[PDB]
C-alpha cells in the first residue's frame, strides 16, 4: 500500500517494510529485522539475597522496575569503543539511613552496605 512504513510480525524477527521513492515514478522495498530483544521479566536476585526460609512483614519493600533509557523514537548515539545501554533495569526502595558494615579477621578487611529503617 501507499503507507510509508509497514511492519510485519514474524511468522524469527519482526519484518519492517519501508517504501522509499527516489523519484515520483520509481520506488523500491527495504526489509530489515529490527531487534526482537525480550527482557527477562525477572532477574535472579539470588545473587542479591539467599532467599531465606522465613521472611517477616516489612514496611520497606523492593520492586523490580523495568526502565527504557531511550524514548519511543528518540535516537541513540554511540561513541567508538563504547556500547549503548537500552534498558537499565532498576530496583526501587519504597515503604532510610545507610552506613557501612566492615567485618575484619586478622587484618582481612571487607565492607558491606546496610540499608535499614
Amino acid at each position: 500500500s501507499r503507507h510509508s512504513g509497514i511492519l510485519i510480525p514474524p511468522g524469527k524477527n519482526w519484518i519492517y517494510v519501508q517504501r522509499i521513492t527516489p523519484t515520483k515514478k520509481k520506488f523500491f522495498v527495504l526489509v530489515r529485522p529490527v531487534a526482537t530483544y525480550e527482557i527477562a521479566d525477572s532477574i535472579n536476585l539470588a545473587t542479591l539475597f539467599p532467599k531465606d526460609l522465613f521472611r517477616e512483614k516489612d514496611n520497606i519493600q523492593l520492586r523490580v522496575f523495568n526502565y527504557i533509557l531511550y524514548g519511543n523514537g528518540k535516537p541513540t548515539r554511540g561513541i567508538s569503543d563504547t556500547s549503548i545501554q537500552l534498558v537499565r533495569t532498576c530496583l526501587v526502595l519504597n515503604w532510610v539511613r545507610a552506613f557501612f558494615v566492615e567485618v575484619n579477621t586478622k587484618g582481612l578487611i571487607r565492607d558491606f552496605i546496610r540499608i535499614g529503617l
Binding site: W14, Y16, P22, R32, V34, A35, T36, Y37, E38, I39, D41, I68, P75, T76, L86, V87
Partner: peptide, 23 residues
C-alpha cells in the same frame, strides 16, 4: 514486554561540508 531498535547511522553535517557519496 517487547522493544525494538532499528540500526540507522544518522549523521548531521554543515552545509559547507563535502559529500563523497551520492544520494
Amino acid at each position: 514486554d517487547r522493544f525494538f531498535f532499528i540500526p540507522e547511522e544518522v549523521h548531521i553535517l554543515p552545509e559547507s561540508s563535502a559529500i563523497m557519496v551520492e544520494n
